[PDB]
């Protein structure tokens, strides 16, 4: 599909033309719409801005120098002068501080008094506060503070080569398994342009293959070398490992550009990103001509954007004569990926491994949270060394398993020692995630119980004993009723094998299977179904339409998506103001693909500036694009988090509730203490304010201002309903004909209304309504009237 | 880390009783101030008299142990068999004493004394 790429390039130049026309409209609107005292005020303002600018740049440049005789003396003088400046400003602030710290009785006010602003350190400090409170309540002394006198103080008489470190670094690089095969590696790289390189873990493929291309000189003409990853954390891990392999700091030739972390100082050879920036400079670049040879991440993660990338790589193989592209791979399932790229050659790498005998149970059971407890007690009475990883499939059962295992641990004293067990979640603060990565005590047999994070993304040190039941939740969406069931499924044989690879990544593995070997070989799955046959494509149909493909269901792929998902996506786009009668994107249809949010959330932007209220619904469209779920309600506490959440509640659905959460988080210092005392995860909603910053930045391309109606939240809900017309319900959905159920975590769990919209259709136990909002079906009939008939 | 053997011997030593540092509600017990004078005005609020106004099982901890006193109090009585000789034990014809276990309405009067457990004690 070379003409597809040519038409996509033509769409890039008319997108630049539309940007130039909007720029011309911007300067058109800009052009259409006591003298020594003025000099003195101009100089006071200009010297104030110059003073703050040099003050901001000063320790920034000290940090820039420290990241890298007279220069040392100037750095010492510069450190001393910022030290004197900070104590000078702290002395002025301290003079103000005990200017404030007086008696200062409250004034008797006419009517109600006015509340003022406050504080101390919230997260964790009250435990040590209670510890030294008990210490001060117990410890005691007498006499005055001058009581050290009359001390004779008798003393005891008693009886009268960094070059070698760099050479060790290349010895470490020589110790890789890819180092004896690097000549055959670059030989096959020069042989074939579509080469798949598979290899077991421990080979160091993602950190040596761009290196082995870098002495191969494929990056020679300034067309740089890129490294995509399924995850930004894995991308930063590979970037940091390669960056300390050469000692080249970030921003320089080993640099990265991910979302809200773009550290490239325009000298970057080894650039590090994920698949979404390959999407974004496909949306800004027609073909990677500024990239000579780019390695490809594995397909076992089965990211939908990487499958679209596989289709684009096959189109590059049709378009360019070559790019000498190469796909790093983990396991031996490369036959389909070989045949997808016109009989692509596959080169295997041997991986250094361990005896990882897969065990079995001589009984079938349907419990797997007490038989494994009996098994880990048997582990604790057999051979001591080795960390324990036990897999489960959900938060609400893994916290109960943690509670009962901690009860079994605290039932015994000196017998059953240590055994600290830590769970892994997604809507989770990262402090105890770092405590997972902390090494075990030597008298401990530390257990990290987990969901699929340790299966897919996470590799932790020292793990030997792994219990596996082979079950995970799948978000299987059926468009026959339009219902997105989150249902627990048994996992795959290759999933159990990569869990065994996680078991034997460090030492001799002890992957205890929680069922029979017959059920592992026969009854278990052997191939994981991808995301396209489990879900819809509502975020990427618009992007694939705007990236020059009109033959979307005729587009080349490994496996096609279900046609009902494409049909409902196109009919939804017809109900949206994005497609014409001929099924093609408009100017608004192109502009809603400028920003990567869903079109169902881009009718937020299309209802923005209809009667304004744009800032509120743009904040809402930022924060409802979160991956991890909001609010941190742990095991125990409960009522404190519930009372904070009830204080956050406002009528009109939970969107206004969490809008109040973000609004009062604004002008709160953006602190961890706020989210700690309000029981909010301080990892995901920080990413939500970063998304809010990015979507504030990406507003001139759609040419929508940051207007707000200043508390007209019924009109904000009118714009929200203008967006959310397909996802509505009367105790029944008017479209899906399904009886609704309200989630207990919703703000409107009580008071079941006559008309409510919703956002999400996840089945867990009941046909649940997630992220509801109260309506009356008045302005619902205003938006998509072709969709709406018979009340 | 602080092991079990660091504070295991001194588990119930100290006036605030070192085991109290590993309590469940000790984090929300960081806010109770003046609970001594709360008890000393709870004597003005409650018609019954508290003898343990001067202590706290959560703050100060538990300050004694009487189970060894119970064991030696049993031992000073000439033994369990000597006690069961005094009681009506052999009329019950149990093989052993070790299986033994002890245990919206309207009425014209409700404050009557229960004759039944004193009768069974007799």
């Amino acid at each position: 599909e070379d003409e597809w790429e040519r038409t996509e390039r033509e769409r890039l130049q008319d997108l630049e033309e539309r940007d130039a026309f909007a720029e011309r409209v911007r300067q058109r609107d800009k052009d259409r719409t006591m003298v020594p005292e003025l000099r003195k005020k101009s100089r006071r303002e200009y010297l104030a801005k110059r003073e703050r600018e040099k003050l901001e740049d000063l320790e920034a440049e000290l940090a820039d120098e420290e990241f890298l005789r007279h220069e040392r003396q100037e750095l010492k003088y510069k450190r001393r002068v910022r030290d004197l400046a900070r104590e000078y400003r702290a002395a002025g602030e301290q003079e103000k501080l005990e200017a404030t710290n007086r008696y200062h009785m409250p004034k008797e006010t006419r009517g109600q008094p006015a509340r003022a602003v406050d504080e101390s350190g919230a997260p964790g400090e009250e435990q040590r506060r209670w510890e030294e409170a008990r210490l001060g309540a117990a410890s005691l002394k007498f006499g005055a503070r001058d009581a050290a006198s009359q001390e004779p103080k008798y003393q005891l008489v008693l009886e009268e080569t960094q070059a070698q470190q760099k050479e060790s670094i290349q010895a470490v690089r020589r110790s890789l398994p890819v180092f004896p095969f690097r000549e055959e590696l670059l030989a096959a790289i020069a042989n074939h342009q579509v080469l798949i390189i598979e290899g077991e873990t421990g080979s160091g493929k993602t950190t040596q293959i761009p290196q082995y291309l870098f002495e191969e000189g494929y990056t020679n003409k300034g067309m740089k070398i890129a490294c995509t990853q399924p995850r930004r954390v894995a991308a930063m891990s590979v970037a940091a490992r390669v960056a300390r392999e050469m000692g080249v700091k970030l921003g320089n030739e080993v640099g990265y550009s991910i979302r809200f972390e773009d550290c490239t100082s325009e000298r970057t050879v080894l650039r590090y990103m994920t698949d979404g920036m390959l999407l974004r400079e496909f949306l800004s670049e027609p073909d990677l001509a500024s990239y000579s040879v780019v390695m490809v991440d594995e397909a076992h993660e089965r990211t939908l954007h990487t499958d679209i990338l596989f289709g684009l790589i096959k189109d590059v193989a049709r378009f360019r004569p070559e790019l000498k592209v190469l796909v790093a791979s983990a396991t031996m399932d490369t036959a389909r990926f070989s045949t997808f790229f016109d009989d692509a050659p596959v080169f295997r790498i041997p991986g250094r491994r361990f005896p990882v005998d897969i065990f079995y149970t001589k009984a079938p059971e349907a419990d797997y949270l007490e038989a494994c407890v009996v098994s880990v007690l048997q582990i604790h009475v057999t051979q001591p060394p080795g960390d324990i990883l036990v897999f489960l499939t959900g938060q609400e059962e893994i916290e109960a398993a943690c509670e009962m295992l901690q009860d079994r641990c605290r039932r015994l004293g000196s017998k059953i020692r240590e055994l600290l067990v830590l769970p892994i979640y997604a809507n989770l603060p990262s402090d105890m995630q770092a405590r997972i990565f902390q090494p075990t005590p030597p008298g401990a047999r530390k257990v990290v119980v987990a969901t699929n994070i340790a299966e897919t993304s996470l590799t932790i040190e020292g793990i030997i004993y792994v219990l596996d039941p082979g079950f995970c939740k799948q978000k299987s969406y059926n468009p026959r009723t339009g219902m997105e069931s989150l249902t627990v499924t048994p996992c795959s044989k290759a999933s159990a094998n990569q869990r065994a690879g996680r078991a034997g990544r460090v030492a001799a593995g002890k992957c205890f299977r929680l069922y029979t070997a017959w059920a592992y070989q026969h009854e278990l799955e052997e191939t994981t179904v991808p995301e396209i046959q489990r879900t819809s494509l509502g975020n990427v149909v618009l992007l694939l339409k705007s990236l020059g493909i009109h033959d979307l269901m005729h587009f080349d792929f490994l496996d096609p998506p279900p046609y009902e998902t494409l049909l409902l996506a196109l009919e939804q786009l017809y109900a949206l103001g994005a497609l014409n009668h001929l099924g093609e994107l408009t100017t608004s249809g192109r502009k809603m693909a400028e920003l990567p949010v869903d079109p169902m959330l881009s009718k937020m932007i299309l209802a923005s500036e209809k009667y304004s209220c744009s800032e509120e619904i743009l904040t809402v469209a930022a924060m409802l694009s979160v991956n991890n779920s909001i609010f941190y309600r742990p095991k125990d506490k409960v009522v404190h988090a519930d009372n904070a959440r009830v204080n956050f509640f406002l009528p009109g659905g939970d969107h206004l509730v969490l809008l109040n959460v973000y609004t009062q988080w604004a002008e709160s210092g953006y602190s961890s203490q706020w989210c700690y005392e309000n029981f909010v995860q301080f990892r995901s909603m920080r990413r939500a304010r970063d998304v809010r910053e990015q979507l504030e930045g990406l507003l001139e391309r759609v040419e929508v201002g940051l207007s707000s109606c200043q508390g007209d939240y019924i009109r904000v809900r009118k714009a929200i309903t203008a967006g959310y017309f397909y996802h509505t319900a009367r105790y029944r959905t008017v479209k899906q004909q399904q009886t609704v159920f309200i989630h207990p975590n919703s703000s409107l769990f009580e008071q079941q209304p006559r008309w409510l919209l919703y956002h999400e259709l996840v089945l867990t136990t009941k046909e649940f309504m997630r992220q509801v909002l109260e309506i009356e079906s008045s302005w619902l009939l205003e938006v998509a009237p072709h969709y709406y008939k018979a009340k | 880390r602080l092991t079990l053997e660091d504070l295991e011997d001194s588990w119930d030593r100290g006036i605030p009783r070192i085991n109290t540092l590993f309590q469940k509600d000790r984090h929300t017990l960081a806010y109770d101030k003046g609970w001594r004078v709360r008890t000393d005005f709870k004597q003005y609020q409650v018609l019954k008299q508290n003898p343990f106004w001067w202590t706290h099982q959560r703050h100060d901890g538990k300050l004694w142990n009487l189970n060894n006193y119970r064991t030696d109090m049993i031992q000073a009585l000439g033994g369990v068999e000597g006690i069961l000789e005094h009681t009506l034990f052999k009329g019950t014809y149990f093989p052993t004493w070790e299986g033994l276990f002890w245990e919206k309405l309207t009425n014209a009067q409700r404050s009557g004394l229960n004759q039944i457990p004193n009768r069974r004690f007799t």
Binding site: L156, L158, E159, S414 | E5, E8, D9
Partner: peptide, 28 residues
């Protein structure tokens, strides 16, 4: 608990360990 016995005897008052500590403080 002979391990806890010798651990308490090694983390006890220990005048000879005090002499090692003070002798190293004097030599240093």
């Amino acid at each position: 608990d002979l391990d806890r016995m010798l651990r308490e005897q090694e983390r006890e008052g220990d005048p000879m360990a005090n002499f090692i500590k003070k002798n190293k403080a004097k030599e240093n």
